[PDB]
Amino acid sequence: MQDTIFLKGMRFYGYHGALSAENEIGQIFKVDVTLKVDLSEAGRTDNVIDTVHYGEVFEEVKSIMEGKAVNLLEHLAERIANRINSQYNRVMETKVRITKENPPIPGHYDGVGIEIVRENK
Amino acid sequence: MQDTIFLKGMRFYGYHGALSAENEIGQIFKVDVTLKVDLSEAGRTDNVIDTVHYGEVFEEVKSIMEGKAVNLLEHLAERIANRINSQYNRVMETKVRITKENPPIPGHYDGVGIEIVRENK
Amino acid sequence: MQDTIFLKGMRFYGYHGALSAENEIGQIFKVDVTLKVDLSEAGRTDNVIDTVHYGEVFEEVKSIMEGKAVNLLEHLAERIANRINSQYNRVMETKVRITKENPPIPGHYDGVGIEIVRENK
Amino acid sequence: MQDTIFLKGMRFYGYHGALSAENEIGQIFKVDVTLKVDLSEAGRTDNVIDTVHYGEVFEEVKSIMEGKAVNLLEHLAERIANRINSQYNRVMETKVRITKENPPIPGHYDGVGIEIVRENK
Amino acid sequence: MQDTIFLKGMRFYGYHGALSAENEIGQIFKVDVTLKVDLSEAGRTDNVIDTVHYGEVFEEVKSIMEGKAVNLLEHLAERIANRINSQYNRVMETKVRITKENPPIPGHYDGVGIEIVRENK
Amino acid sequence: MQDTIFLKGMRFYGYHGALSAENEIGQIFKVDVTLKVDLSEAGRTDNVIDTVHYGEVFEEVKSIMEGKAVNLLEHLAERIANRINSQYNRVMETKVRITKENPPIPGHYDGVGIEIVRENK
Amino acid sequence: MQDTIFLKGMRFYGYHGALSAENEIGQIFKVDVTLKVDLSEAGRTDNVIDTVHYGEVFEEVKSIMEGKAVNLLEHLAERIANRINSQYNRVMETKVRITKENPPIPGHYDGVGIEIVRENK
Amino acid sequence: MQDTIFLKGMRFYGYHGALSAENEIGQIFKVDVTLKVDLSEAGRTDNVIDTVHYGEVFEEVKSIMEGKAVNLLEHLAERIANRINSQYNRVMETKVRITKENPPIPGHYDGVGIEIVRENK
Ligand SMILES: Nc1nc(O)c2nn(-c3cccc(C(=O)NCc4cc(Cl)cc(Cl)c4)c3)nc2n1
Ligand SMILES: Nc1nc(O)c2nn(-c3cccc(C(=O)NCc4cc(Cl)cc(Cl)c4)c3)nc2n1
Ligand SMILES: Nc1nc(O)c2nn(-c3cccc(C(=O)NCc4cc(Cl)cc(Cl)c4)c3)nc2n1
Ligand SMILES: Nc1nc(O)c2nn(-c3cccc(C(=O)NCc4cc(Cl)cc(Cl)c4)c3)nc2n1
Ligand SMILES: Nc1nc(O)c2nn(-c3cccc(C(=O)NCc4cc(Cl)cc(Cl)c4)c3)nc2n1
Ligand SMILES: Nc1nc(O)c2nn(-c3cccc(C(=O)NCc4cc(Cl)cc(Cl)c4)c3)nc2n1
Ligand SMILES: Nc1nc(O)c2nn(-c3cccc(C(=O)NCc4cc(Cl)cc(Cl)c4)c3)nc2n1
Ligand SMILES: Nc1nc(O)c2nn(-c3cccc(C(=O)NCc4cc(Cl)cc(Cl)c4)c3)nc2n1
C-alpha cells in the first residue's frame, strides 16, 4: 500500500531550541507531514468521511508547533506523529520532517533538521 | 523494471472540493502522473506505436480534471488512474499525485494533497 | 533622496474580497512595503532611535491585514499607507503593494493586485 | 500619480508566430499587464465600482491571446493595450509585456519578447 | 552498494520528436544521468583513474543529444545508457531521464518525459 | 517612447577573463539584452519586416560571446552593443548586461557583472 | 550615464543587530552593491586598469560585514558606501542594499532591510 | 529504522579538483549530509545529549571542505563520512552528497557530483 495524504512546507514561527537566545528570539520552523492511508474507499465513495481531513491535520501540527517551546526538533516531531497516530486509526504510519532553515549555525546552507517515521499501533 | 513515462506539474483550474464555496470559486489543481511502462522496445525501434503517447495521457487527465466537480481529490485520482490503466495495457501501474496548493486552510504551507498508486489488472 | 526601508513578501491569511465566498474561505495576501526615509543620521549614529523600526511597521501592516475583512485591496493598502505615514514623521512617502496570488479567477497567472504610493503630509 | 493595477505571469497556449511550424505546434505565451489607475477613490470608498476589475482585464487579454493566430507579439500587445484602454476610461495608460520563453531559437536563454506602453487617449 | 556519480539538468537544443514540425523547429531537451559506481577505491586513493570522469560522460550524452534527430525520447535514452555502459566497466547500471519541458502539447505543465534504468552486462 | 525588445538570461560558455586560469577553464556568461525600438508600426501591420528579429539579435550576441576570449566584460558588452546598434537603425539604444555568476572570487554571492547602455548614433 | 558594476546577493554571517540575542546568535546578511561607473574606456581598451575590480569590492564589503558587530543595517551600508567611494574615484555613486531575510520578527515575509545611495564627492 | 538527521545545501568555497587551474581558482562545493540515527529517545526525553548535534556535524564537514585541496570529490566525501561515523556511535550510517555546480565542463547543466553511503562499523 503506497497511498499517502500529505502536507508540505508548513511554516510556523516558534521558540523551540536548546539555546536560550533561540527561545528568546524564535524562528521559522518548516514542517512536512506524510500519512500512509489507504485511499481506495474514498476514491470510490467520494465521501470525505472515508479519509483523513488534511485541514484537521494542519490544526494538530499547528497546535504543537505554535505552543510551548521545547528543546529538540525530535521532541516536536514525536509529539506530532503521536498526536496524529492517536486520533486517526486510518493512518497506518506518520512521517514528520522538521527543518530549521535558519539555525544559530554560522555558515551557508539551505537548512538542518530531522525526520521521523512512526507506525500507528 | 524501473522504466517510467511521466507528466509533471499539470495544472488545471477546477471546482472540486467538499466545501460549497470551493465549488463556487474553484482553484488550481496540480497533477503529477507516473506510469510504469517497459520502454525497451520503443528504445530499440524508435516507433511511437511501441510506447504510450504522453499527449493522449494529458488529454485523459485534463478531461477528468476540467470536468464535473467532485468532493475529494481521492476520487479524482481514482478516476484518472482507472482511466489510464483501462486504455493502456502497456501501463503496468499508474501513480497519481494531486495537490491543492491553495486550499481553504488558514495558514502558511506549500500545499496539501494525496497520491495514489494503482497497478493495472 | 533615494534611501529606503523595506518589508518584502509579507504574507497574511485574510478574508477580504468583493465576493461572499472569498470572505468565507479567505486566502493569502502578499504585501510589499517601501518607505522613503533619509537614513544618513542612523547611518552615522548607529542609534535605532534615528530611524524607523521595521518590526513596528510589520505589526502595523499585520493588524490591518489580519483584521476586519474589506472589499478591495485598494482599501487595505490605503489604510496601511495612512497608518504608517501617520505614526512616522521620518517616512516621507509610503509605497504599498498587495497581491492576490490566488484570486477566484479561472486561469494561469502568478498573481494580481495593486500598488499605491502615498506621500506623507 | 504612481498607482497601478497589475496582472502578472498570465500564461496562454497560443499559435502566434511568423513561422508556419509555430502556428502549427503553438506554444505558451507569458503576459504581464500593468495599468496606471488612480486608486484613491476606491481606497477611500472600498466600492469595487470605483476601480478596474482585474478579472475583466484577464478576460480581455485571454480572448486576444487565445484567439486568432497572428505573426507578431507586437500585434498581440497592441490589440490588448488598445482593448483595455478602449473599455476603461480610468486606465490612464497600459503596459503590456509578452514573452516567448520557448521560441524556435536554438540556444539557452530565459526568454525573448516585447513590452509596449500605451497612454489612453 | 548505493554509490553514484551524477549529471543533472543537462540541456541540449535538439530536433528529435515524432512530429515533422518538431524536427523542423527543435527544442530544449533536459537530461539527468545517474551511474551506479562503487566509489570506495577512488575515495581511498584520490586517483581520478579509479572512478568515472563526469566530463567524459557529458561528452557522450552531448554527442547523442546534439546529433541525428530521432523520433522518441526512449530511443535517445537507450542510446546513451548503452553508450555509457559500453565504455565503462565500472558503471554497474545507468539511469537516464529525458524531459521535454516544452512539447507541442496545448496546456500548462512543468514537463513530460521518460526515464530508463539499464544494468551493465 | 518606452517600447522595448528583449532577450533575457542568454547563457554562453566562454573563456573571457583577466586571469590565465579563467581563459583556460572558461565559464558560463549570462547575458540580458534590451533594445529601445518603437514597436507601433509592427503593432499595426503585424509584418515582421517592421521590427527587429529577436533571432538575429541572439545570433549577434552569440558570435561575440562564443568567440575570441577577451579580458573584460566591459569589452564584450561594448562589442555587442556596437554590433547591434550598427546593423539596426530601428534600435534607438542598446542595453547590455553581462553577469559572471561564478567568478574566481572566494565567497557566497549570486553574481557579479556590468551593464552598459548605448544610444545608437 | 547609466553604466554600472554590480555585486548581487553577497551573503555574510554576521552578528549585527540592536538586540543582545542577535549579537549572540548572529545571522545571514544579504548584500547588493551597485556602482555607477563610466565603462566606456574599459569597453574600448579591455584593460582591467580602466575599471573597478569587482573582486576588490567584494573584499571591502566582506571586511565590513564580517567584522565588528554594530546595531543598525544603516550603519553597515554607510560604512561600505563610504569605503568604496573613498578608495575609487571612478565610482561616481554607490548603492548599498542590506537585507535581513531572517530577523527576530515573528511572521512570514521574504525579508526586511534598507538600501542607501551615496554619491562620491 | 527510517529516522534521519540532515544538513542540506552546505556550501563551501574550496580548491579541490584534478585540474591545476581548479586548485588555483577554486569554486563552490555544495554538500548534503544525511545521518541514520534512531531519534526516539531524544523524541522522548527532549535532552540534546540523546541525539547528534547538527552544529558539530557542520563543523566537521566544514573543516574537511575548507581545508587541504584534494583531487576527487570521492575523497572528500570519504573523509567526511569517515569523520562523522568515527566520532558518533549513534550514527548508524552516513550519506554524503557533493556537487560541483560549476565544474570546468563546457556546457549547460545544473551540476555534477557524487554521493556515497557508508555504514558505521
Ligand atoms: N538534533 C538536534 N536538534 C536540535 O533542535 C538542535 N539544536 N542544537 C543547537 C543548540 C544550541 C546551539 C547550536 C549551535 O550553535 N549550532 C551551531 C554551532 C555554532 C557554534 Cl559558534 C558552535 C557550535 Cl559547537 C555549534 C545548536 N543542536 C541540535 N541537535
Ligand atoms: N482527504 C481530503 N481531500 C480533500 O479534497 C479535502 N477537502 N477538505 C476540506 C473540505 C472543506 C473544508 C476544509 C478546510 O477548511 N480545511 C481547513 C480548515 C479550516 C478551518 Cl477554519 C477549520 C477546519 Cl476544521 C479546517 C477542508 N478535507 C479534505 N480531505
Ligand atoms: N481592483 C480590484 N480589487 C479587488 O480586490 C477585486 N476583487 N475583484 C473580484 C471580485 C469578485 C469576483 C472576481 C472574479 O471572479 N474575478 C475573475 C472572474 C471570474 C469569472 Cl467566472 C467571471 C468574471 Cl467577470 C471574473 C473578482 N475585482 C477586483 N478589483
Ligand atoms: N519582434 C519579433 N516578434 C516576433 O514574434 C518574432 N518571431 N520571429 C521569428 C520568426 C521565425 C523564426 C524565428 C527564429 O527561428 N528565430 C531564431 C533563429 C533560428 C535560426 Cl536556425 C535562424 C535564424 Cl536567422 C533565427 C524567429 N522574429 C520575431 N521578432
Ligand atoms: N513516449 C513518447 N515519447 C515521445 O518522444 C513522444 N512524442 N509524442 C508526440 C508526437 C507528436 C505530437 C504530440 C502531441 O501533439 N502531443 C500533444 C497533443 C496535442 C494535440 Cl492538439 C493532440 C494530441 Cl492527440 C496530442 C506528441 N508522443 C510521444 N510519446
Ligand atoms: N570590471 C571587471 N570586469 C572583469 O571581467 C573582471 N575580472 N576581474 C578579475 C580578474 C582576475 C582575478 C579576479 C579575482 O580573483 N577576483 C576575486 C579575488 C580573489 C582573490 Cl584570492 C584576491 C583578489 Cl584581490 C580578488 C578578478 N576583475 C574584473 N573587473
Ligand atoms: N532600521 C532598522 N534597522 C535595524 O537593523 C533594526 N533592527 N531592529 C530590531 C531590533 C530589536 C528587535 C527587533 C524586533 O524584534 N522586531 C520584530 C518585533 C518583535 C516583537 Cl515580539 C515585538 C516588536 Cl515591537 C518587534 C527589531 N529594528 C531595526 N530597524
Ligand atoms: N569522479 C570525478 N570526480 C571529480 O572530482 C572529477 N574531476 N574531473 C575533471 C578533472 C579535470 C578536468 C575535467 C573537465 O574538464 N571536465 C570537462 C571536460 C572538458 C573538456 Cl574541454 C574536455 C574533457 Cl575530456 C572534459 C574534469 N573528473 C572527475 N571525476
Coordinates of C-alpha atoms in Angstrom, one line a residue, chain F residues 1-120:
Chain F
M1 CA 9.0 56.1 -26.1
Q2 CA 9.2 53.2 -23.7
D3 CA 8.8 50.3 -26.2
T4 CA 11.4 47.5 -25.9
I5 CA 12.5 44.2 -27.4
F6 CA 14.3 41.9 -25.0
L7 CA 16.5 38.8 -24.7
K8 CA 16.8 37.5 -21.2
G9 CA 19.2 35.1 -19.5
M10 CA 21.2 34.2 -22.6
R11 CA 23.9 31.9 -21.5
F12 CA 27.1 31.1 -23.2
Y13 CA 30.2 29.1 -22.1
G14 CA 33.1 31.3 -22.8
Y15 CA 36.8 31.9 -21.9
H16 CA 37.0 35.6 -21.2
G17 CA 38.6 36.9 -18.0
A18 CA 41.7 38.8 -16.9
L19 CA 43.1 35.6 -15.2
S20 CA 45.0 33.0 -17.2
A21 CA 43.2 30.2 -15.4
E22 CA 39.9 31.7 -16.4
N23 CA 40.8 31.6 -20.1
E24 CA 42.0 28.1 -19.6
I25 CA 38.9 26.7 -17.8
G26 CA 36.2 29.1 -19.0
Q27 CA 32.8 29.6 -17.5
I28 CA 29.2 30.5 -18.2
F29 CA 28.3 34.1 -19.1
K30 CA 24.7 35.2 -18.6
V31 CA 23.5 38.0 -20.9
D32 CA 20.5 40.3 -20.9
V33 CA 19.9 42.5 -24.0
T34 CA 17.3 45.3 -24.1
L35 CA 16.6 47.3 -27.2
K36 CA 14.6 50.5 -27.3
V37 CA 12.6 50.2 -30.5
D38 CA 9.3 51.9 -31.5
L39 CA 7.0 48.9 -31.9
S40 CA 3.9 50.7 -33.1
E41 CA 4.2 50.1 -36.9
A42 CA 4.7 46.4 -36.3
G43 CA 1.9 46.5 -33.8
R44 CA -0.2 47.9 -36.5
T45 CA 1.0 45.9 -39.5
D46 CA 1.9 42.6 -37.9
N47 CA 4.7 42.5 -40.6
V48 CA 8.0 41.1 -39.2
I49 CA 9.8 43.5 -41.5
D50 CA 8.6 46.4 -39.4
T51 CA 10.6 45.4 -36.3
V52 CA 13.8 43.8 -35.1
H53 CA 14.0 39.9 -35.3
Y54 CA 15.0 38.7 -31.8
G55 CA 16.5 35.6 -33.5
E56 CA 19.1 37.7 -35.5
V57 CA 20.0 39.5 -32.3
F58 CA 20.7 36.3 -30.4
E59 CA 23.0 35.2 -33.2
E60 CA 24.9 38.5 -33.0
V61 CA 25.4 38.2 -29.2
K62 CA 26.3 34.5 -29.5
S63 CA 29.0 35.2 -32.1
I64 CA 30.6 37.7 -29.7
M65 CA 30.1 35.6 -26.6
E66 CA 31.3 32.4 -28.1
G67 CA 34.2 33.8 -30.0
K68 CA 37.7 35.2 -29.1
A69 CA 38.4 35.4 -25.4
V70 CA 38.9 38.9 -24.1
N71 CA 39.8 40.3 -20.7
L72 CA 36.8 42.3 -19.6
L73 CA 33.1 42.0 -19.6
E74 CA 33.0 45.7 -20.5
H75 CA 34.7 44.9 -23.7
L76 CA 32.3 42.1 -24.5
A77 CA 29.2 44.3 -23.9
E78 CA 30.8 47.2 -25.9
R79 CA 31.2 44.9 -28.9
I80 CA 27.6 43.6 -28.7
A81 CA 26.0 47.0 -28.1
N82 CA 28.1 48.3 -31.1
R83 CA 27.3 45.3 -33.2
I84 CA 23.5 45.6 -32.7
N85 CA 23.4 49.4 -33.0
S86 CA 25.4 49.2 -36.2
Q87 CA 23.2 46.7 -38.0
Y88 CA 19.8 48.0 -36.9
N89 CA 18.7 51.6 -37.4
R90 CA 15.4 50.9 -35.6
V91 CA 17.3 50.3 -32.4
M92 CA 17.4 53.7 -30.8
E93 CA 19.5 52.5 -27.9
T94 CA 21.0 49.2 -26.6
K95 CA 21.4 47.9 -23.0
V96 CA 23.7 45.0 -22.4
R97 CA 24.0 43.2 -19.0
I98 CA 26.7 40.6 -18.6
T99 CA 27.0 38.5 -15.4
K100 CA 29.6 36.1 -14.2
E101 CA 27.6 34.1 -11.7
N102 CA 30.7 32.1 -10.9
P103 CA 33.9 34.2 -11.0
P104 CA 37.2 33.2 -9.3
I105 CA 36.0 35.1 -6.2
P106 CA 36.1 33.1 -2.9
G107 CA 32.7 33.7 -1.4
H108 CA 29.0 33.4 -1.4
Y109 CA 27.0 35.7 -3.9
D110 CA 24.6 35.4 -6.8
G111 CA 26.9 37.0 -9.3
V112 CA 28.9 40.0 -10.4
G113 CA 29.0 42.0 -13.6
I114 CA 28.4 45.1 -15.6
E115 CA 25.6 46.6 -17.6
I116 CA 26.0 49.3 -20.2
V117 CA 23.5 51.4 -22.1
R118 CA 24.5 52.8 -25.5
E119 CA 22.4 55.0 -27.7
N120 CA 22.5 54.4 -31.5

